[PDB]
Amino acid sequence: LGWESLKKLLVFTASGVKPQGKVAAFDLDGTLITTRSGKVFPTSPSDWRILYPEIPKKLQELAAEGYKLVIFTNQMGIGRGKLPAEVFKGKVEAVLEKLGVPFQVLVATHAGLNRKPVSGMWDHLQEQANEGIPISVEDSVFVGDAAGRLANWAPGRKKKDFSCADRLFALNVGLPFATPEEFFLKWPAARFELPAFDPRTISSAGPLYLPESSSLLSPNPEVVVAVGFPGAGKSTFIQEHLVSAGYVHVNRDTLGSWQRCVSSCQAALRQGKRVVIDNTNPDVPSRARYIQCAKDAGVPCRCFNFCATIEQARHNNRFREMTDPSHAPVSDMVMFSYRKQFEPPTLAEGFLEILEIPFRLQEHLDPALQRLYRQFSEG
Ligand SMILES: Nc1ncnc2c1ncn2[C@@H]1O[C@H](COP(=O)(O)OP(=O)(O)O)[C@@H](O)[C@H]1O
Ligand SMILES: [Mg+2]
Ligand SMILES: [Mg+2]
């Protein structure tokens, strides 16, 4: 073999591979190879050819210069049961034979930590798969076609890149980056864009809530109704600021229905408690029930309106998926459904007051998780 099957990762190490202190790493599909058929997707495991004739010679030269040659490739078809692992393995081996140089190959079979642009595969190389030889990121390079290049970026290249995953993988790690044309053909740098949402720019600056004249807490019984996307940070915020103050946390996540949120709310008010309703509550009718509960109990009802944008929330959801196994994944469809349903909270509903909660960065207490949190996690 030379193949290893690990946790959501395949690693192949060709005979002849040596650990080195610098790496020249490459995406596979559309970077080293493309379809022989000229179709966008291969019509079978045999439907491949070396992308540019220049490739094998450049690779030999890189090996001669002391770079360990590495491939990082997303193949989530494997984890999804669409592409048998052994089939992909056979294709890899056929490609490597044609290329004619020793390679180590890492294959992210699933979503999550190992899937470019997240750095999981780089980290595995650095920590586990290089025989302890430290790798200099600055002396290394990553080459891939998923580079966020814009439409009509060169003569004969009308379509924009489908993805920016390769560029973002390099950005997350700190690797110098090039496209296959820039790298193998010495084309000038093409125009590109990164995703509009940049997790590096999320700031811990500014107020915890608005308006600053208001008070986050009430000394007396009340109902607080949270509003926000899944992934807006509702439960976390509540845990940090409200539960620590003695509020009863009514969490839809753990209660399994909104009906149980209602009954739990009524129960807590009956106990003379302060209560916060943790649910998405995008629509007027959902919120209306808790306002009514407040009324029945003769207590005020406030709204905490969590301002996280849909892309901030999706980023948080992907992060949660990578760090919190207990929790179930949130699809784009659930997110678009929230967006479809969303009606801004107003005082016309009967809230005593509405506080806006900006998405303020609160850094993760484990530095490895904080590092992860700062990574682009979507191509
Ligand atoms: N202010 C913040 N800064 C950084 N990460 C956050 C912040 N708030 C929440 N998160 C993270 O984002 C993810 C979603 O948070 P969570 O409280 O579960 O959102 P919700 O309850 O609205 O679904 C979690 O992984 C959490 O650790
Ligand atoms: Mg590619
Ligand atoms: Mg929650």
Do residues 147 and 251 share a domain? no
Q: Which residues are annotated as a binding site for ATP?
A: 228-235
The backbone torsions φ and ψ at residue 60, rounded to the nearest 5 degrees and listed phi first, read: -60, -45
Nearest alpha-carbon partner for 13 in 89, 65, 66: 89
- Ligand 3 centroid–CA 154 distance in Å is 46
Which ligand gives the minimal distance to the CA of 319?
1
Check pocket membership of 122 for ligand 1, CB cut-off 6 A.
Answer: no
CA 239-241-244 angle, to 5 degrees, is 70
State which of 167, 194, 221 marks the end of a domain. Answer: 194
Percent helix, strand and coil across the chain, each to the nearest 5: 35, 15, 50
| Cα–Cα dist 84/311, whole Å | 33
- Ligand 2 centroid–CA 51 distance in Å is 11
Q: Coil, strand, or helix at residue 76?
A: helix
> What CATH number did the domain enclosing 304 receive?
3.40.50.300
Half-sphere exposure for 188 (CA within 13 Å, toward CB): 4
Mutate which of 261, 316, 361, 377 for ligand 1? The one with the most ligand atoms within 8 Å of its CB, which is 316
Do residues 173 and 211 share a domain? no
Check pocket membership of 362 for ligand 1, CB cut-off 6 A.
Answer: yes
Nearest alpha-carbon partner for 285 in 349, 353, 355: 349
- Tokens 């009863």 correspond to 248
This structure's resolution (Å) is: 2.0
Domain that holds residue 70: 1-194
- Ligand 1 centroid–CA 313 distance in Å is 8
Query: Cβ–Cβ contacts within 10 Å for residue 367, how many?
Result: 9
Do residues 165 and 296 share a domain? no
Q: Coil, strand, or helix at residue 251?
A: strand
DSSP strand E in the chain: where? 3-6, 9-13, 23-26, 33-34, 49-50, 68-74, 104-108, 141-143, 177-178, 223-227, 248-251, 275-278, 301-306, 354-357
Do residues 119 and 221 share a domain? no
Nearest alpha-carbon partner for 169 in 132, 241, 116, 217: 116
Q: Which CA distances in Å does 98 have to 35, 55, 94, 101, 103?
A: 15, 11, 6, 8, 12
- Ligand 2 centroid–CA 245 distance in Å is 50
Residues with CB under 5 A from ligand 2 (ion): 27, 29-30, 145
Do residues 224 and 312 share a domain? yes
Check pocket membership of 248 for ligand 1, CB cut-off 6 A.
Answer: no
Q: Is the dihedral of CA 145, 377, 110, 26 positive or negative?
A: positive
- Ligand 2 centroid–CA 165 distance in Å is 9
Mutate which of 197, 200, 236 for ligand 1? The one with the most ligand atoms within 8 Å of its CB, which is 236
Atom of ligand 1 nearest to the CA of 359: 1
- Tokens 């080459």 correspond to 143
SS (HEC) of 258-304 = HHHHHHHHHHHHHCCCCEEEECCCCCHHHHHHHHHHHHHHCCCEEEE
- Ligand 2 centroid–CA 57 distance in Å is 20
Atom of ligand 1 nearest to the CA of 253: 21
Q: What residues contact residue 28 under an 8 Å CB cut-off, 6+ apart?
A: 71, 73, 92, 95, 105
> What CATH number did the domain enclosing 124 receive?
3.40.50.1000
Residues with CB under 5 A from ligand 3 (ion): 235, 253
Atom of ligand 1 nearest to the CA of 230: 23
> What's CA 332's distance to the chain center, in Å?
12
Task: Name the residue with the closest Cα to ligand 1, atom 24.
Answer: 320
Check pocket membership of 199 for ligand 1, CB cut-off 6 A.
Answer: no
Do residues 151 and 276 share a domain? no
Do residues 34 and 168 share a domain? yes
Do residues 256 and 187 share a domain? no
State which of 132, 162, 194 marks the end of a domain. Answer: 194
Do residues 149 and 231 share a domain? no
| Cα–Cα dist 6/161, whole Å | 31
Do residues 42 and 153 share a domain? yes
- The size of the chain, in residues, is 379
**Do residues 194 and 167 make contact, with C-beta atoms less than 8 angstroms apart?**
yes
The backbone torsions φ and ψ at residue 168, rounded to the nearest 5 degrees and listed phi first, read: -75, -35
Mode of pairing for the β-strands spanning 301-306 and 275-278: unpaired
Nearest alpha-carbon partner for 105 in 174, 19, 3, 173: 3
Do residues 171 and 92 share a domain? yes
Which ligand gives the minimal distance to the CA of 366?
1
Atom of ligand 1 nearest to the CA of 362: 3
Check pocket membership of 316 for ligand 1, CB cut-off 6 A.
Answer: yes
CA 44-45-50 angle, to 5 degrees, is 110
- Ligand 2 centroid–CA 28 distance in Å is 6
Q: What residues contact residue 63 under an 8 Å CB cut-off, 6+ apart?
A: 69, 101, 102
Half-sphere exposure for 253 (CA within 13 Å, toward CB): 16
**Do residues 13 and 68 make contact, with C-beta atoms less than 8 angstroms apart?**
no
- Ligand 1 centroid–CA 105 distance in Å is 34
Do residues 252 and 136 share a domain? no
**Do residues 225 and 252 make contact, with C-beta atoms less than 8 angstroms apart?**
no
Token pair for residue 166? Answer: 């390769």
| Cα–Cα dist 335/329, whole Å | 11
Check pocket membership of 361 for ligand 1, CB cut-off 6 A.
Answer: yes
Burial class, 15, CB count within 10 angstroms (exposed 0-12 / middle 13-18 / buried 19+) = exposed
CA 158-375-331 angle, to 5 degrees, is 75
Task: Name the residue with the closest Cα to ligand 1, atom 16.
Answer: 233
**Do residues 48 and 40 make contact, with C-beta atoms less than 8 angstroms apart?**
no
State which of 169, 194, 219 marks the end of a domain. Answer: 194
Atom of ligand 1 nearest to the CA of 229: 22
Identify the DSSP state of 198: -
Structural domains in the chain (count): 2
| Cα–Cα dist 222/272, whole Å | 9
